[PDB]
Amino acid sequence: KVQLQQSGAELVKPGASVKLSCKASGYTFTESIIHWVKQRSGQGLEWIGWFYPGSDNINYNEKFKDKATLTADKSSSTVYMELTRLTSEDSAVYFCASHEGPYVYFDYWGQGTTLTVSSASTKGPSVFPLAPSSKSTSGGTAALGCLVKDYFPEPVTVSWNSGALTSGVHTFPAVLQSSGLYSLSSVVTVPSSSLGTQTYICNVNHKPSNTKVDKKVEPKS
Amino acid sequence: QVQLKESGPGLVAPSQSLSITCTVSGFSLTVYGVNWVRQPPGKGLEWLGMIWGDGSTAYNSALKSRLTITKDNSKTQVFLKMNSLQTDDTARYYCARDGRRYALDYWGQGTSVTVSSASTKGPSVFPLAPSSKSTSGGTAALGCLVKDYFPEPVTVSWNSGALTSGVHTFPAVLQSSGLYSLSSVVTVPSSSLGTQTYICNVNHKPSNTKVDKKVEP
Amino acid sequence: TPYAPEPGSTCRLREYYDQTAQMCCSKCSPGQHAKVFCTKTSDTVCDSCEDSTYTQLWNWVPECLSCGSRCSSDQVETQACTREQNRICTCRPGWYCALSKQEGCRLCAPLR
Amino acid sequence: DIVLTQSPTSLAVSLGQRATISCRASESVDSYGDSFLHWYQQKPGQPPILLIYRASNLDSGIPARFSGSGSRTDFTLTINPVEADDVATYYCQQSNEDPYTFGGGTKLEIKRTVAAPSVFIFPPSDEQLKSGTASVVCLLNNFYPREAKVQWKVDNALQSGNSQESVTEQDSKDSTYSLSSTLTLSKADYEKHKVYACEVTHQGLSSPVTKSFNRG
Amino acid sequence: IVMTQSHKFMSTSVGDRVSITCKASQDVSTAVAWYQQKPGQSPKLLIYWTSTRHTGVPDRFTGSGSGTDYTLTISSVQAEDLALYYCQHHYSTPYTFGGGTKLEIQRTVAAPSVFIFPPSDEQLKSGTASVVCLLNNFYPREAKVQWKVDNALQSGNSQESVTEQDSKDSTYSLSSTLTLSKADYEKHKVYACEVTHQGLSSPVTKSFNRG
Numbered sequence: 022k023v024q025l026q027q028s029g030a031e032l033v034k035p036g037a038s039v040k041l042s043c044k045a046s047g048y049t050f051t052e053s054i055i056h057w058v059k060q061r062s063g064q065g066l067e068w069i070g071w072f073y074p075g076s077d078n079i080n081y082n083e084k085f086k087d088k089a090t091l092t093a094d095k096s097s098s099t100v101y102m103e104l105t106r107l108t109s110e111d112s113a114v115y116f117c118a119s120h121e122g123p124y125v126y127f128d129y130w131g132q133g134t135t136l137t138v139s140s141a142s143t144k145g146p147s148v149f150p151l152a153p154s155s156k157s158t159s160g161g162t163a164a165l166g167c168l169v170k171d172y173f174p175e176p177v178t179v180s181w182n183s184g185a186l187t188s189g190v191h192t193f194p195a196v197l198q199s200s201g202l203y204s205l206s207s208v209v210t211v212p213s214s215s216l217g218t219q220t221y222i223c224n225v226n227h228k229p230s231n232t233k234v235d236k237k238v239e240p241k242s
Numbered sequence: 243q244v245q246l247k248e249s250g251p252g253l254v255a256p257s258q259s260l261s262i263t264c265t266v267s268g269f270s271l272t273v274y275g276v277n278w279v280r281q282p283p284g285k286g287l288e289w290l291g292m293i294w295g296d297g298s299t300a301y302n303s304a305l306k307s308r309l310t311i312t313k314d315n316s317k318t319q320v321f322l323k324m325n326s327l328q329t330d331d332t333a334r335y336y337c338a339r340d341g342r343r344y345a346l347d348y349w350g351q352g353t354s355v356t357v358s359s360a361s362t363k364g365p366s367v368f369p370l371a372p373s374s375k376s377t378s379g380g381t382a383a384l385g386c387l388v389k390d391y392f393p394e395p396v397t398v399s400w401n402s403g404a405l406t407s408g409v410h411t412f413p414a415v416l417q418s419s420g421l422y423s424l425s426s427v428v429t430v431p432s433s434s435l436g437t438q439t440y441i442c443n444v445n446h447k448p449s450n451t452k453v454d455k456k457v458e459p
Numbered sequence: 460t461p462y463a464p465e466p467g468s469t470c471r472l473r474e475y476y477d478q479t480a481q482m483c484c485s486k487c488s489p490g491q492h493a494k495v496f497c498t499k500t501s502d503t504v505c506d507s508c509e510d511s512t513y514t515q516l517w518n519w520v521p522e523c524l525s526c527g528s529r530c531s532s533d534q535v536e537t538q539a540c541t542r543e544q545n546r547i548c549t550c551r552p553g554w555y556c557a558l559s560k561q562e563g564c565r566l567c568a569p570l571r
Numbered sequence: 572d573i574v575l576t577q578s579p580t581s582l583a584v585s586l587g588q589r590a591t592i593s594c595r596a597s598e599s600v601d602s603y604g605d606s607f608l609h610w611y612q613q614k615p616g617q618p619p620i621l622l623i624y625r626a627s628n629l630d631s632g633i634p635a636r637f638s639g640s641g642s643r644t645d646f647t648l649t650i651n652p653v654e655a656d657d658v659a660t661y662y663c664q665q666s667n668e669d670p671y672t673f674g675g676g677t678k679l680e681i682k683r684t685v686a687a688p689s690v691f692i693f694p695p696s697d698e699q700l701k702s703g704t705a706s707v708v709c710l711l712n713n714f715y716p717r718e719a720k721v722q723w724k725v726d727n728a729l730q731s732g733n734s735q736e737s738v739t740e741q742d743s744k745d746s747t748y749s750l751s752s753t754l755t756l757s758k759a760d761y762e763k764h765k766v767y768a769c770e771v772t773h774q775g776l777s778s779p780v781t782k783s784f785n786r787g
Numbered sequence: 788i789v790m791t792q793s794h795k796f797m798s799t800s801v802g803d804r805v806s807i808t809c810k811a812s813q814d815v816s817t818a819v820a821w822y823q824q825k826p827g828q829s830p831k832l833l834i835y836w837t838s839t840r841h842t843g844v845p846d847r848f849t850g851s852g853s854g855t856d857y858t859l860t861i862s863s864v865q866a867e868d869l870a871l872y873y874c875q876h877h878y879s880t881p882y883t884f885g886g887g888t889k890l891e892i893q894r895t896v897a898a899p900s901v902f903i904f905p906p907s908d909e910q911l912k913s914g915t916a917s918v919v920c921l922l923n924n925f926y927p928r929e930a931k932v933q934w935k936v937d938n939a940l941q942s943g944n945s946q947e948s949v950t951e952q953d954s955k956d957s958t959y960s961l962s963s964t965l966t967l968s969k970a971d972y973e974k975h976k977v978y979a980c981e982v983t984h985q986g987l988s989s990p991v992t993k994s995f996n997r998g
Contacts, residue, residue, distance in 0.1 A: 046745065049654060050586070054558075054565055065873060066830070068882040073566075076559055082881045095587040097684050098655075116829060122531065123550065123558070123567045125877050126820045128841070130829040149910040151919070154902055156995075164902050168910075168917055168964075183377045184432040185459065191923075191960045193948040198966075206919050206948065206962040208902075226379075235374075269521070273496050275479070279619075279673075286676040287611075287619070287662060294479060300669045303572050336618055341521050343478045344666045345609055345624035352618070368696040370708060375692050375782050383691050385708060389699075412737040412751045424737065425751050427691075427710055469604040476603050478666060520631050532839065569816075569878045 023047040025055075025117055025131025029228040030176035033107055034140055041102040043117035043131055050098035051075040054119055057089065057102055060133065061113040072100055104136075112137040112175075135176035144202060146172035148225045148236040151208065155240050158213055165216075165238050166208030167223040171200065174229035179207040181223050186211075216240065244268035246276075246350035248337040252448035253356050253393045260324040264337030264350055271295060271313065275340045276320040278311070281352070282333040292340070293320065332357045356393040360420060364449040365391030369442070369457045370425060377459075382432045384457045386442030389423040397445045400428055405440070435459050460485070460502055475519055486517045490542030493519045508542060515543050527562075534563070573598055573665050575674035583680035586746075590650045592677050594663030599643045602667050606642040609664040613676075615740045619662065623648055655681065656743040681746035687775040688714035692767075692782040705761040709769035709782075710751040720772035721752045724781075726765050730754065788812050790819075790876055792885045799864055800893050807888045809857040809874035818877040819857045821850065824887065825870040826951065833872070834859065866892065869952045892957040896986035899925030899961075903980050903993040916972045920980030920993065922961040924953075930984040932963050935992070936975045941965070 024046045031039045045053050057069040070081035072091040079091060088111075090103040104111065114133035120126050147170040154163035169179060181190050189210050195203035211221055217240065225234040250262035264276060277292030291301040291311040299311050310323045320337065334352030341347050370385025388396060398411050408429045414422040426442065436459075443454040462474060462483045470476055470483040477484045477497040484497030487505040492514060495504040508514060512523035526540035530548035540546035548563035550556040558566035574597045584590045600606055605626040613619035621630045627639030638649045650657060662676040693708040709721060717738060723730040733756070739749045752769070768783035793808045809819060821833040832841045834850040837857055852858045861868055871887030900923040906916045922930060928949070934941040945965035953959065963980065979994035 051652065052560065052565070065871075065886045066824075066884045068884070070880075071566075073558060078558060080880060084881070096585050098586070120565075123556065123563065123565050124533070124818075124835075125566060125882070126832060126835040126875075127822075127830070128832050130831070133829055147910075147913070149907050149913075149917070152904040152907070154904060157902070157993075160900065162900070164921065164923070166919075166921075168906075168919060170917070180432075183374060183435070184380075185436050187433075191950060193950060193960065193962045196946045196948050196964065198946065204964065206921070206964060208921055208962070210923060222374075273498075286660070287613070287673045289664070289671050289673055302670050303672075342621070342624060342630075343475075343519070344671070345621055345630075346611065346619075346664075347621045347624075347630070349618035349620070366702070368699050368706075370693045370696060373694070373784065375784050378689060378691070383693075383710075383712070385693050385710075387696070387706065387708065389706070410739050410742075410749050412739055412749065415735050415737050417735075423735075423753070425708055425710065425753070427712060427749055427751060429712065464603065466603075518631075522631065524631055532836070 023119070023129045025119065025129055027115070027117060027132050027134045030135045030174065032137055032139070032143055032174050032229045035108055035138060037107050037138075038103055038105055039107070039136060041104070041115055041117075041134055041136070042099050043102070044097065044099045045119070046098070050095060053098070055091075055100045056118055056120075056125075056127070057091075058116045058118060058127075059085075059111075059113050060116060066116075074100070107138045109138050112139070137175050139173075141173055141201070143230040144171060144173045145230045145232040146170065146177065146225055146227050146234065148223070148234040150223075150236055150238040153211070153216055153238075153240050155216075155242075161213045162210045163213050163216055164208050164210040165221055166206060167225065167236060167238065168204070168206055169195075169225055170204045171198070171202040172204070172227055172230075173202050174227070175203060176227075176229060177203070177205065178226040178228070179205065179223060180226065181207070181209055182221060183224055186221070244339070244341075244348050246337045246339060246348060248335065248350035248353055250335060250353035250355055252353065252395060253358060253362060254327060255359055256327055256329055256357055258327055260322075260327055260355065262322045262335050262337075262353065262355075264320045264322075266318055266320065266337075266339070269339065269341065271315050271318060271320070275344075276313075277338055277340060277346070278322055279336045279338055279346075279349075280333045281336070282330075285333075287336075288333075290335075291322070292344075327357050329357055331355075354395045356395075358393070360392055362448045363390065363392045363421065364451045365389065365396060365444055365446050365453070367442075367444055367453050367455050369455045371457050372459050377432055377435070380432045381429050382435055382459065384428045384430060384440055384442075384459075385426050386428070386444070386455060386457065387423070387425045388444050390417070390419075390421045391423075391446055391449070392421050393448050394422060395447065396422075396424075397447070398424075398426065398442065399444075400426070400442050401440060402443070405430075461497065461499065473517060486519060489514050489517060492521060492523055494521070496521075511540050511546070513540060513542050513544060530563075572670055573600065573668065573672050575663055575665065575672060577663060577674045577676055579677060580675055581678040581680070583682045584653050585682045586655060587652055590653055590679060592648045592661055593641075594646045594648075594674055596644055596646070596665065600665045600667050601643050606646070607666040608639075608641075608646055609662075609666065610637075610639065610648045611662045611664065612659045613662065614659040614743070650679075653679070653681075655746055658741050658743065658746065681741055683715055683746050685775055686713055686715040686747075688712065688719060688771055688773050688780075690769055690771050690780050690782050692769060692784050694767075694784050700758070700761075703758040705756045705758065707754045707767055708751055709754070710749070711771065711773075712749055713747055714750065714773055714775060715746070715748055716774075717748060718773060719750055721750065722770050722772075723752075723754050724768045724770065788815075788876070788879045788881065788883060790815075790874060790883050790885045792874065792888050795886055795888055797888055797890050798893060799890060801864055801866075803864060804860055804862050805864060805868075805890060807859045807872055807890075809859075809885065811855050811876060813855075813878075815855060815876045815878060817853060819850075820875045820877070821848070821859050822873045822875070823870045824873065825954070830873070864890070864892070866957055867954055868892070869954055869957070891952055894926060894957050897924055897926035897958060898986055899923065899930060899982055899984050901980065901982050901991055901993045903978075903995055905978075905995060911972070914969045916967050918965045918967075918978055918980075920963045920965070922959075922982060924956075924958040925961065925984060925986070926958055927985050928959055930961065930982060932961070933981050933983070934963070934965055935979045935981060935994075937977050938979075939975075 054073045093100045116133045117131040118127040151166040153165040275294045278290035293299045337350040368387040445452040480499045491505045491507045493505040508523035526546035533551040537549040538547040550567040556564040558564040610623035611619040623639035660676045695705045770779040820835045822830040824830045949961045981992035
C-alpha cells in the first residue's frame with residue numbers, strides 16, 4: 022500500500038548538484054523513515070544513512086559521508102537528497118526505500134531514478150519507423166519496430182501502443198554508436214493477419230530532453 | 243456491535259407527511275437516548291428533538307410544534323414523524339445516540355430528504371471511454387457519466403467495489419432543465435490497459451434501478 | 460449514591476454529573492465500564508471490560524479501548540495488556556533500540 | 572436559547588502546522604465545574620464523529636493531537652499537528668439548557684505546494700449521439716489550488732454560457748482537487764460544427780495546454 | 788563489515804535446485820534478507836530472518852542455514868527465476884550487500900528467425916540509412932551475423948545488441964544496425980544479412996533489393 026515516488030530522469034555535468042526527491046504516499050510522514058541506496062551499472066547495491074523526520078534522526082554511511090545531504094520539509098511529505106561533487110562515477114540508478122518493522126528490511130522499494138553524469142548535452146531521439154515483413158508473410162509473424170536513434174541520455178522509454186500491447190515486445194539495450202549517442206531497435210512480432218487491420222503506434226518518452234514522440238508505423242507498398 | 247441504520251423517503255411533496263426510522267443495535271434503548279440532527283446541503287448542523295429512555299422528549303425552539311418523536315422500545319426503533327414540510331426543509335437527517343452524557347458518539351448515515359414536486363426520473367449512463375488523448379505518461383483515465391436523474395442521491399461504484407484507489411465522484415450540478423448530472427475520473431495504471439476489465443455501476447434508490455456499464459479503451 | 464447537587468457547589472472528585480437524572484453520581488474503578496448508566500435512584504452499575512480492553516482512568520464510557528494485536532516475531536512484550544494498561548511492544552531480546560516511537564520504536568540494533 | 576458564533580468560518584493550514592478555532596458563546600455555558608461543550612467533526616460525506624466531549628475531556632479512541640480548553644465564554648480546540656486527512660468541518664455544541672444549539676462551524680483546508688493540472692478530453696458516447704445530445708468532458712486532475720480557468724473553443728469560437736463545472740473536495744490522503752467541465756449541445760447544433768479543444772489557465776503549467784480530439 | 792556471496796553465475800534448468808550462498812564477515816547470527824532484482828525494475832523482498840518467508844512470495848523460495856553461512860534455494864525453478872539475488876544483514880550502521888548471483892536457465896536448441904527490412908524514406912532523407920537485421924528466439928547465444936552487400940563483405944559497419952534470458956521461455960533476441968553514409972547506400976543494389984547458428988542445419992541468408 023505504501024508507495025515511494027521519485028522524479029523521472031535528470032542529467033548533470035561534473036561539478037553539479039541535482040536534488041533527488043522521494044515522496045511517500047499511504048501513511049503519515051511524522052512516522053516514515055527513509056533510506057537511500059545506489060545501484061551502479063552491473064555491480065551490487067550499496068547503502069546510505071536514514072532520515073527519520075519525526076525525531077529528525079539523521080544517520081550516514083561511512084563511505085557516503087561527504088556526497089549526500091538529506092533534508093525534508095514537513096509540508097509535502099518529501100525527502101530531498103542533494104548530491105555534491107558529481108564525478109563520472111555517480112551515473113547510476115538511485116533508489117529510496119523504507120521498512121515497516123523495527124529491524125530494517127526493505128519492503129517498500131521506490132522507483133529508481135537514472136541519474137547520469139557527463140559533460141555533453143542532451144539530444145532528442147529520432148524515432149524512424151521500421152517496415153514490417155509484408156514480403157515475408159510465409160512466417161506469419163512479421164515484426165515491426167521503431168529505430169530510436171541518436172539520443173544521448175541513457176534513460177529512454179519505448180512504450181508500444183501506449184502500453185496496450187506488451188506481448189513479445191523486445192527492447193534491445195542501447196548501443197554506443199561512433200557519434201557517441203545511444204540507439205535501440207525496439208521491435209514487436211505482431212500476427213500477420215492483424216498487421217493490416219490494426220494500428221501499431223509506438224511512443225518514445227525521452228524524459229531528460231522533455232521530448233515525447235508519437236510516431237506512427239504502417240506497411241507501405 | 244453498535245450500529246444505527248437510518249431510512250427515510252427520498253422525495254416528499256411540500257406540505258406532506260414525513261417519516262424517518264432509525265434502527266439501533268448494540269445498546270439498550272431503556273437507558274440510552276436517541277436524538278436526530280439535520281443538515282442542509284453545505285450548511286452547518288441544526289439540532290432536532292431527543293427522546294430519553296423513560297419517554298420524556300425535548301424538542302427544538304423553532305420546530306416545537308412540528309416534530310412528533312416517538313419510540314418503539316420493544317422493536318428497538320426510533321421513528322420520527324414530521325408535518326407541514328416547507329420547501330426549505332431539504333437536508334440530511336442523521337440518527338444518533340447520546341451514549342456519553344449527551345456527548346453524541348455514534349451516528350447513522352443520513353437519507354438526504356428532498357422536497358420537490360418533480361416526478362422521479364431514472365439516470366442515463368454513458369461509458370465515457372478513454373482514447374489516445376487520455377493516455378498521458380503512465381496513467382490513463384476512464385469515465386462513467388451519469389445524466390438526467392432526479393432526486394439528488396445516487397450511488398456509484400467501480401468494479402463492484404473492488405476498485406477504490408484513484409476514484410472520484412464529482413458533486414451533482416443542477417441542470418437548467420431541472421435535473422442532475424455527474425461523471426467519474428477513475429485513473430488506472432497504463433501498464434495494464436488491455437487487461438483488468440473495468441465495470442462501473444450506478445443505482446438510484448428513488449427510481450429503483452441498478453444500471454451497469456463496462457469501459458473498454 | 461445519587462448525591463443531590465446544589466447550584467453554587469460542584470460535585471466531589473470521583474463523582475460526575477449525569478445529564479439524564481440531573482443528579483450527581485459516582486465514578487467507578489478503572490478497568491470496568493458502566494453497563495447501566497446512573498438513574499434517579501440506581502447508582503452506576505459498571506462491569507469489567509473484556510479481554511485486551513483497558514481503561515486507565517476513572518470512566519463512565521460504555522466501551523473500553525483496545526491494545527495491539529501482537530508483537531509479531533522477535534518482539535517480547537514489556538508490559539502485558541491488563542485492565543489498566545496497554546500492550547507495549549519493544550525490541551528483540553539481546554538487542555537494544557536506538558530510535559523511538561509512541562510505544563514501540565522503528566529501528567533496533569545489536570547489543571554491541 | 573443559546574447562540575454560538577464560530578471564529579473563523581473557513582481556514583487553510585498546511586500539513587504539520589498549528590490550527591486554532593474558537594466557538595464563542597453569548598451566555599456562560601459553564602453549569603457545574605468545567606464548561607459543557609462539544610467539538611464534533613464531520614468529514615466530507617461521512618457522519619460526524621466526536622472529539623473533545625466536555626470542555627477538554629477527550630473521547631476514547633481519538634488521536635492525542637486534539638485538545639480542549641476554555642470556560643464560560645472563550646473556547647479553543649487545538650490541532651497542533653495537522654495531517655492530510657484532518658480535513659472536515661469542526662462544530663460546537665453546548666449541553667446545558669434545552670434546546671442544544673449547534674453553530675456554523677469551520678472548514679479546515681490544506682495549502683500544499685502548487686501542483687500541475689492535466690487536461691483530459693473525453694468525447695461524447697455514441698449512445699448519447701443516438702439519443703440526440705452531445706456532451707464533451709474537459710476534466711482536469713490533481714490540480715491545486717481551486718483557481719483554474721477552463722474555456723472551450725469550438726473551431727476557435729469560444730463558447731460562453733453553455734457549459735457547467737463541478738469541483739470535488741480535497742482528497743483525504745494527499746489534499747487533491749479535481750474539476751470536470753462539461754460542454755452540452757443539441758444534435759442539430761452538433762452537426763453544424765467541427766473539431767473541439769480546451770484550455771487551462773491555472774497557475775501551474777506555464778502556458779494554456781490544449782488537448783484536442785478530431786470530430787468523427 | 789562486508790557481506791559477500793561465493794559464485795556469480797548459477798546455471799540451472801527447470802526442475803533442478805539452486806543453492807545461492809551468502810557468507811558474512813562476522814558472526815551475523817540470524818540476520819539476512821534476500822532480494823530478487825529482475826533487471827529494469829526495483830528490488831523485491833524474498834526472505835528475512837534467514838528463514839521467514841515474506842508475504843506473497845512463493846513457498847519454493849525457502850531460506851535455510853544459520854550462523855555465518857546462508858543459502859536460498861528453489862526446488863521447482865520456473866522460467867521467471869531470472870534475476871540478481873542479493874543478501875543483506877541488519878547489524879552495523881553501514882549496511883552492506885554483495886554481488887549479484889544471477890541465475891540462468893538452460894534448455895534445448897532453438898531455431899533463430901531472421902527478419903530483414905529496408906529503412907524508411909524520411910530516414911534516407913535525413914542522411915544516414917539503417918538496414919537492421921534481427922534474430923528472434925535463438926539459443927545457444929553463440930550465433931554469428933554477417934553482412935553481404937552485392938555479395939561483398941563488410942567489417943566495422945554494424946553493431947550488435949542482444950537481450951538477456953527471456954523471462955517467459957529463456958530464449959534470446961539479437962539485432963544488427965548496419966548504417967551507411969548518404970552516398971554509400973545508393974552505390975549498391977542488393978543487401979543481405981546471413982546467420983550462422985548451432986541450431987541451424989545450414990546458414991540462412993535473408994536478402995532484399997531496392998524494390
